[PDB]
Design a protein around this ligand. Structure first.
Ligand SMILES: O=C(O)CCC(=O)C(=O)O
Ligand SMILES: [Mg+2]
Length: 267
């Protein structure tokens, strides 16, 4: 079972410890009292739904910056999935460019600006708490790490229900913040120990956090890069918003040396 962590827990050592053990054992957790405006989240979702109904020929303008950034229409590899997004989410220029590409309204534009700044703050905050949970000196390790924004539209038809919508996988970055679909469940993750899956049901006003491959590398294997998938449980439309804190992009990720011991040989 995925644990729910209270980010307004009064005690730093309890809070950081909860986060670390969740990140090591399950590779994921929910956060409550995250500090992201609930109204901003709903408006971001409204903006997402509306953005996906832009002209196809406009959507196609959402060009890759990184391979996979930008638009992907459903195809025969993964037929139920449509997506948009931008690289370097921390850059107001990058966000604006994305909004220029999708011809967002001015109102929409500034919804995106505010969401990105909020979500990216939650991300830096969570990452720092992870550094703190290990008593690291390098409590700023991520300060030059770029983020990637990606909004997703899942189309499940009656054919799809009972089966999956996306196959089992790990995020390649450090940390992911997911705003799932309020009224359409289906996200599942595998317990590495058992091999069994458990669901990540969309609990209202919460945000889902999971760790990716970069976190495992950085932590020399202590942090779990959770395997997850979304399974179709009903043939409806489905929207989700994801913000990825990635590893460094120019450099190569190797761990703070505090993680590499004679009992933790390098990977
Ligand atoms: O759409 C979802 O429910 C999860 C999204 C996800 O896993 C991703 O964008 O990497
Ligand atoms: Mg994912």
């Amino acid at each position: 079972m995925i644990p729910t962590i209270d980010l307004e827990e009064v005690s730093d050592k309890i809070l950081n410890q909860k986060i670390r053990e969740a990140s090591e054992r399950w590779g994921c957790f929910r956060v409550i009292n995250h500090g992201v405006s609930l109204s901003l989240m709903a408006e971001m979702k409204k903006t997402v739904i509306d953005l996906f109904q832009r002209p196809y020929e406009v959507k196609v303008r959402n060009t890759d910056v990184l391979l996979g950034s930008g638009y992907r229409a459903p195809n025969e590899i993964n037929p139920y999935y449509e997506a948009l997004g931008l690289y370097d989410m921390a850059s107001p220029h990058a966000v604006n460019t994305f909004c220029d590409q999708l011809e967002a309204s001015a109102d929409q534009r500034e919804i995106m600006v505010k969401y990105a700044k909020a979500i990216n703050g939650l991300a830096t905050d969570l990452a720092r708490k992870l550094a703190e949970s290990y008593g690291l000196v390098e409590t700023d390790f991520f300060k030059e790490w770029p983020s990637q924004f990606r909004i997703n539209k899942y189309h499940f038809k009656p054919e799809t229900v009972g089966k999956l919508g996306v196959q089992l996988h790990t995020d390649s970055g450090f940390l992911t913040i997911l705003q799932d679909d309020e009224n359409v469940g289906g996200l599942e993750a595998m317990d590495n120990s058992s091999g069994t899956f458990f669901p990540i049901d969309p609990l209202p006003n919460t945000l889902a956090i999971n760790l990716g491959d970069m976190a495992t590398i950085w932590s020399n294997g202590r942090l779990c890069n959770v395997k997850h998938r979304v399974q179709c449980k009903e043939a409806t439309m489905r929207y989700s918003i994801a913000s990825f804190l990635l590893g460094p992009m120019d450099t190569d990720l190797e761990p703070p040396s505090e993680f590499v011991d004679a009992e933790h040989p390098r990977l």
